[PDB]
Design a protein around this motif. Structure first.
Motif, mmCIF file in Angstrom:
data_model
loop_
_atom_site.group_PDB
_atom_site.id
_atom_site.type_symbol
_atom_site.label_atom_id
_atom_site.label_comp_id
_atom_site.label_asym_id
_atom_site.label_seq_id
_atom_site.Cartn_x
_atom_site.Cartn_y
_atom_site.Cartn_z
ATOM 1 N N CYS H 6 100.565 -119.279 -115.049
ATOM 2 C CA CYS H 6 99.322 -118.873 -114.401
ATOM 3 C C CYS H 6 98.742 -120.058 -113.996
ATOM 4 O O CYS H 6 98.792 -121.144 -114.674
ATOM 5 C CB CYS H 6 98.432 -118.067 -115.411
ATOM 6 S SG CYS H 6 96.744 -118.124 -114.670
ATOM 7 N N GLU H 8 95.533 -120.412 -113.425
ATOM 8 C CA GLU H 8 94.020 -120.604 -114.148
ATOM 9 C C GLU H 8 94.016 -121.166 -115.259
ATOM 10 O O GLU H 8 93.389 -122.184 -115.741
ATOM 11 C CB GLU H 8 93.261 -119.144 -114.031
ATOM 12 C CG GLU H 8 91.841 -119.204 -114.443
ATOM 13 C CD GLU H 8 90.983 -119.896 -113.266
ATOM 14 O OE1 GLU H 8 91.713 -119.874 -112.025
ATOM 15 O OE2 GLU H 8 90.068 -120.499 -113.418
ATOM 16 N N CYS H 9 94.472 -120.536 -116.282
ATOM 17 C CA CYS H 9 94.683 -121.065 -117.676
ATOM 18 C C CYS H 9 95.928 -122.041 -118.081
ATOM 19 O O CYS H 9 95.948 -122.696 -119.124
ATOM 20 C CB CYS H 9 94.492 -119.977 -118.720
ATOM 21 S SG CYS H 9 95.745 -118.551 -118.549
ATOM 22 N N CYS H 28 98.943 -112.858 -117.389
ATOM 23 C CA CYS H 28 98.734 -113.597 -118.725
ATOM 24 C C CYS H 28 97.791 -113.117 -119.445
ATOM 25 O O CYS H 28 96.914 -112.026 -119.144
ATOM 26 C CB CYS H 28 98.593 -114.758 -118.218
ATOM 27 S SG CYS H 28 96.953 -115.070 -117.043
ATOM 28 N N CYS H 31 93.598 -114.888 -118.860
ATOM 29 C CA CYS H 31 92.656 -114.714 -117.758
ATOM 30 C C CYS H 31 93.414 -113.518 -117.138
ATOM 31 O O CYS H 31 94.310 -112.768 -117.715
ATOM 32 C CB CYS H 31 92.538 -115.659 -116.849
ATOM 33 S SG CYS H 31 93.935 -115.904 -115.893
#
Ligand SMILES: [Zn+2]
Ligand SMILES: [Zn+2]
Lengths: 147, 209, 104, 96, 145, 265, 97, 114, 48
Positions: H6, H8-9, H28, H31
């Motif tokens: 991912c 984002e994380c 995921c 998030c």
RNA sequence: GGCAUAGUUC
DNA sequence: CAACGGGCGGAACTATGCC
DNA sequence: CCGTTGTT
């Protein structure tokens, strides 16, 4: 290796290993590693020369000795796990010479192959005509003789 | 497969015929020796959805010394025989006035059923034989020497001759394969007849205990 | 393996229970169709629909190899030999494909 | 050249090792037989072997002709170093 | 679940009651992202077999996601388990700073190198499991002092 | 060779080539282009797949058949799975499995794992490897008596397995139930009794002693075997067997347990 | 006795271990009594048969007279008696020894 | 096949089912970042795994002094005569004693197997 | 230790210290080991 | 006097 | 299935440290 | 390494 042979920065005791396949270089300054001296073969000719031999055989009143041989980059100390990246020759004037090519990339040479025996097994004459248990028994009984 | 199931049923029947013949019961030569095709013809070559359904194969046979003493060989159709099945079989034995019976099991019997078999021992005698234990006759194996069950008269004579108490004989467990094959209770003595390398024959004796 | 196996079997049974459409409504067998045994319920979840479905394949294989009687004999021999529907299909397929390789 | 074919019930390494050991054993035995049959009627090794006093034809063979193969744990000498027996051999050398 | 997981990688830290999964230790060092942990372990990401081999180890990170809770999990199993939590977390940090890989370093900022060396240990374990390097022998004399 | 195949354990991993788990909800438009024709001919359900590929060499070595594999799968899992299989005509032999908390991917990985390490297509469990070689000894050969009374030695194939399960091998079709033997004394006991265990123990002792060419009188062998198998059950010569005897405490105290035996008595 | 032997010893092994060395005893008797093998003898084959039968009764391992004891002795001396009869057969005595 | 992360994380993306459009989504657990994949195959397991080491053989082995050398096998690319050779030099390689070759000319690094 | 007290009784049977029969005749024939020799049967192998 | 450890012979 | 406990050659001869 | 006893 050049620095270790010159004896400038790295002491002669330090070992250096390159694992070509696994891409790792390992340098040991540790205490307790066991090592033995070996002659150095550069292309196919020993770096040990008749001038070295004469200067050694005039060893008295000449202050030329084993340290002065080592400092010249002629011999070298090889520990056990540096022996795994080296190509040795048992006898110079027999294995360096032109033959049916077995190996043409020798990297070192043995001083004399009879230096593989200990103190008590260096007194047996013709140990290569004997049997290994007999050599072991004599190594045992050499510490019991009376003199 | 149907062929394999017919083969297993035929082999079990043949081994039980041999067992009854050894136990002294009266089984004829033709019953003893049936070919696979003869068995297929007589009682169905199709097991699945066919005449042989682990029933009608039950065997009732009379001992050579007493037609009144007879034995049953029942074939439960259930992989795990239960208390109610054992009760049904005991009811049938009671109504037919039969003392002893064999029970060949598909896979096994529950411990409750085994204890409910042990409990009625003086009233009735029933033995459990797995389906795998009868595909072969252990007696025919060359490692197994001949066994002979000895009467009380022969035991008494033997004990008197050698001046032995029954504690002083070699023993054989009541759960032994050959002991179960011959149906021997505790206190009976079997005789072993085997050839010898240094004498030519040697007869031993074993006490079931 | 026994304790883990039993737990696996029980788990499998429980996951299967949890993955059911919650009412296992027992629908009846299917009536007919020149086929033999057409009233048979002998193979679970097989149908007279499937019997007719296979008949086409036999008739066309025979017709191109070159009759509806021989089709019914091929079907009926297969229907006796069969015990599961995917196997019944597999037999039908195998005959038609490999005989097509001989019609070629 | 991968032209060696495995023997049934054996791996490729196993069949190669079996063939090599068989060839070497045949060589050792043939040299031993030659050494035995080349003896003399006054030879003292023969005197002490024929009469059964002490010794054997294998000892005579090892003295005269060939000591023979050395084995560790029933197999040939293993690869103590990285893919070679001693620092005096190239890597992956299966010669006698 | 065990049959689907297959193999998992665990670490036996000194002065700790029982085993710890490796991702927990890496998180306790201060690395949170699976991308960063796999940067420390798998050097060349074009190795799908190595990635698949390490995946079940990362599937134990479904719960633990932060340094504080990872330290708590590590310190829960000390020589004498504490009655409090701050003391347990301090004990966990002390063990990871004093008794795990002392030769790499003992200063405060040694985590960035302890992580690399632990990743190297895990990488060599993966290479051994994949049959790419020969297992060591204790009788080899280069492995003696 | 047929009996050799019958008596050797083999799961699906021994014959499978490769396996994979796909996501293909469309029965017609199949992600894999190879199965297209026959999957269309074959064609609620779940959209996931379990596609496995069987190695041809191992498939044809054991004389196995894809119909046999399919029916074994049906027996092992019942009709809650679906199975569609190609035939050996095409170069690629394909099996496609679909299902007819509790999520699909994790269930399919457990189905694959069980189906590859628990299937038991053929053979007898616990029988790992079975050899097949002609005998070269007069005790492992069958010797008959001709119609003229002499002894003639015959060479017949004899098998030698690894791992023991004696009862099943004896019950197997086309296996001699008389001369078949193992070298596990406990197995011989639990299958054939106590006299058979005595005879087998004597034979094993004779073999180990005479491997060296040495000779020991038969009386001593017979005495040891009778001593070991006198009381109806196997009596190992250890502290367990020595103290199992109903002898005086002073004989047992001098052997591998002194204080414990004395205090018990 | 031949059939009994063939049952006891399948795989046809003649070598056996028995207490009296009959062939060496016969050789010793020949040398002790200066027997000339080129001449007809004065041994009656009926005397041979009766002598062997009477001899076999004096080789007693199990002492008794009950059927059980007699069966035990027969089993205890079966192999040696078979060997004894085979060796002291009248035709073999008349031709060879 | 491979692992995808991912954005984002930066955690591993697990496969998740979209029961509306009959499509595969990678999502995921940290998030709510979603994705659509092109492999369309969650898991692949090959049990033969007879990997050709030519991918795993490094061209730097030509500097090994302990390896045998031959001049009867010229390099396919640069026509250099001398060429080092060795065996599988790896475990899990069945028992194949097939040879492998590496050209000893600098910067060539051709690694073949006749 | 296993066979330290097994003896030949005046009954000719072989019994342990608890007078439990091991062999009804020692060696199944009743003879001593140091008095027997190898011999050939000479009527087993010949044809009819 | 005893306990322990080391070495050696067969 | 896991944890615990007992079992592991025969003789012989010197020396040294310590209670 | 493998016979007992507990726990499940
Ligand atoms: Zn995310
Ligand atoms: Zn090149």
């Amino acid at each position: 290796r050049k620095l270790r042979r010159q004896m400038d920065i790295i002491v002669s005791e330090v070992s250096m290993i390159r694992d070509i396949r696994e891409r790792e270089i390992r340098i040991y300054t540790d205490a307790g590693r066991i090592c033995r001296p070996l002659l150095i073969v550069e292309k196919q000719k020993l770096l040990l020369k008749k001038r070295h031999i004469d200067q050694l055989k005039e060893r008295e009143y000449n202050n030329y000795s084993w340290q002065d041989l080592v400092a010249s980059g002629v011999v070298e100390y090889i520990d056990t796990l540096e022996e795994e990246t080296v190509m040795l020759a048992m006898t110079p004037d027999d294995l360096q010479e032109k033959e049916v090519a077995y190996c043409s990339t020798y990297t070192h040479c043995e001083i004399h192959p009879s230096m593989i025996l200990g103190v008590c097994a260096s007194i047996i004459p013709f140990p290569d005509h004997n049997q290994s248990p007999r050599n072991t028994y004599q190594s045992a009984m050499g510490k019991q003789a009376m003199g | 497969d149907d062929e394999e199931e017919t083969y297993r049923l035929w082999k079990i029947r043949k081994t039980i015929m041999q067992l009854c013949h050894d136990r002294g019961y009266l089984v004829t030569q033709d019953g003893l020796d049936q070919t696979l095709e003869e068995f297929k013809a007589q009682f169905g070559g199709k097991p699945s959805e066919g005449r042989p359904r682990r029933t009608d194969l039950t065997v009732l046979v009379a001992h050579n010394d007493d037609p009144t003493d007879q034995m049953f060989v029942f074939f439960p159709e259930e992989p795990k025989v239960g208390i109610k099945t054992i009760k049904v079989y005991c009811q049938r034995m009671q109504e037919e006035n039969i003392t002893r019976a064999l029970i060949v099991v598909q896979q096994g019997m529950t411990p409750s059923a085994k204890q409910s078999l042990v409990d009625m021992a003086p009233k009735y005698i029933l033995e459990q034989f797995l389906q795998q234990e009868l595909l072969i006759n252990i007696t025919e194996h060359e490692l197994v020497p001949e066994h002979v069950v000895m009467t009380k008269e022969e035991v008494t004579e033997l004990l008197a001759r050698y001046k032995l108490r029954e504690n002083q004989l070699p023993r054989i467990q009541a759960g032994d394969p050959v002991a179960r094959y011959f149906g021997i209770k505790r206190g009976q003595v079997v005789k072993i007849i085997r050839p010898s390398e240094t004498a030519g024959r040697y007869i031993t004796y074993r006490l079931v205990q | 393996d026994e304790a883990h196996k039993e737990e696996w079997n029980l788990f499998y049974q429980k996951q299967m229970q949890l993955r059911k459409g919650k009412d296992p409504k027992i629908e009846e067998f299917v009536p007919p169709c020149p086929l033999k045994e057409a009233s048979s319920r002998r193979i679970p979840r097989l149908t007279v629909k499937a019997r007719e479905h296979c008949l086409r394949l036999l008739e066309e294989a025979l017709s191109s190899n070159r009759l509806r009687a021989k089709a019914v004999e091929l079907e009926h021999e297969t229907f006796r030999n069969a015990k599961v529907a995917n196997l019944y299909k597999a037999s039908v397929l195998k005959k038609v494909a490999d005989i097509h390789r001989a019609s070629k | 050249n991968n032209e060696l074919e495995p023997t049934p019930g054996n791996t490729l390494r196993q069949t190669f090792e079996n063939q090599v050991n068989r060839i070497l054993n045949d060589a050792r035995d043939k040299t031993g037989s030659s050494a035995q049959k080349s003896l003399s009627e006054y030879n003292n090794f023969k005197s002490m072997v024929v009469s059964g006093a002490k010794g054997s034809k294998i000892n005579i063979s090892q003295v005269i002709a060939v000591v023979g193969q050395q084995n560790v744990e029933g197999k040939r000498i293993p690869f103590g170093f990285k893919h070679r027996t001693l620092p005096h051999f190239i890597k992956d050398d299966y010669g006698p | 679940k065990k049959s689907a997981i297959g193999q998992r990688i665990v670490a036996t830290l000194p002065y700790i009651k029982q085993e710890v999964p490796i991702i927990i230790v890496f998180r306790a060092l201060g690395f949170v992202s699976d991308r960063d942990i796999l940067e420390h372990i798998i050097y060349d990401f074009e190795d799908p077999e190595m990635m698949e081999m390490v995946k079940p180890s990362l599937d134990e990170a479904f719960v633990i996601q932060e340094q504080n809770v990872a330290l708590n999990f590590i310190g829960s199993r000390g020589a004498k388990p504490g009655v409090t939590k701050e003391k347990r977390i301090k004990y966990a940090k002390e063990v990871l700073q004093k008794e795990m890989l002392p030769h790499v370093g003992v200063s405060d900022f040694c985590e960035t190198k302890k992580a690399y060396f632990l990743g190297y240990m895990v990488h060599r374990l993966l290479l051994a499991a994949l049959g790419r390097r020969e297992l060591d022998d204790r009788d080899h004399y280069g492995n003696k002092r | 060779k047929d009996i050799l195949c019958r008596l050797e354990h083999t799961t699906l991993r021994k014959v499978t080539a490769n396996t994979a788990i796909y996501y293909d909800p469309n029965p017609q438009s199949t992600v894999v282009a190879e199965d297209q024709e026959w999957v269309n001919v074959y064609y609620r359900i779940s959209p996931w797949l379990l596609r496995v590929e069987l190695d041809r060499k191992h498939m044809t070595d054991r004389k196995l058949t894809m119909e046999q594999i399919a029916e074994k799968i049906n027996a092992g899992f019942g009709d809650d799975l679906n199975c569609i299989f190609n035939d050996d005509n095409a170069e690629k032999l394909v099996l496609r499995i679909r299902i007819m908390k509790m999520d699909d991917d994790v269930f399919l990985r457990c189905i694959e794992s069980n189906m590859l390490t628990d299937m038991t297509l053929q053979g007898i469990e616990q029988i790992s490897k079975v050899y097949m070689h002609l005998p070269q000894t007069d005790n492992k050969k069958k010797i008959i008596i001709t119609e003229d009374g002499e002894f003639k030695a015959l060479q017949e194939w004899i098998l030698e397995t690894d791992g023991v399960s004696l009862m099943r091998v004896l019950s197997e079709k086309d296996v001699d139930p008389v001369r078949t033997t193992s070298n596990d004394i406990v197995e011989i006991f639990t299958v054939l009794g106590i006299e058979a265990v005595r005879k087998a123990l004597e034979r094993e002792l004779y073999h180990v002693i005479s491997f060296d060419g040495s000779y020991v009188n038969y009386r001593h062998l017979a005495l040891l075997c009778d001593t070991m198998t006198c009381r109806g059950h196997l009596m190992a010569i250890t502290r367990h067997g020595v103290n199992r005897q109903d002898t005086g405490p002073l004989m047992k105290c001098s052997f591998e347990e002194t204080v414990d035996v004395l205090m018990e008595a | 006795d031949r059939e009994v032997l063939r049952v006891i010893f399948p795989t046809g092994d003649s070598k056996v271990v028995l207490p009296c060395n009959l062939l060496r005893m016969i050789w010793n008797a020949q040398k002790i009594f200066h027997i000339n093998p080129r001449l007809p003898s004065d041994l009656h084959p009926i005397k041979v048969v009766e002598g062997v039968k009477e001899l076999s009764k004096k080789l007693v391992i199990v002492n008794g007279d009950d059927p059980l004891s007699r069966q035990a002795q027969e089993n205890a001396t079966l192999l040696f008696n078979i060997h004894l009869r085979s060796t002291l057969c009248s035709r073999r005595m008349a031709e060879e020894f | 096949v491979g692992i995808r992360f991912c954005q984002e994380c930066n955690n591993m993306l697990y496969p998740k089912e979209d029961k509306e459009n009959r499509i595969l989504l990678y999502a995921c657990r940290n998030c709510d970042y979603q994705q659509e994949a092109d492999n369309s195959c969650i898991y692949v397991n090959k049990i033969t795994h007879e990997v050709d080491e030519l991918t795993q053989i490094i061209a730097d082995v030509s500097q090994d002094p302990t390896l045998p050398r031959t001049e009867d096998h010229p390099c396919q690319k640069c026509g250099h005569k001398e060429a080092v050779f060795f065996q599988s030099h790896s475990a899990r390689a069945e028992d194949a004693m097939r040879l492998y070759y590496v050209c000893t000319a600098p910067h060539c690094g051709h690694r073949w197997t006749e | 230790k296993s066979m330290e007290s097994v003896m030949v009784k005046y009954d000719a049977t072989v019994r342990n210290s608890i007078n439990q029969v091991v062999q009804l005749r020692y060696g199944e024939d009743g003879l001593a080991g140091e008095s027997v020799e190898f011999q050939n049967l000479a009527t087993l192998k010949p044809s009819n």
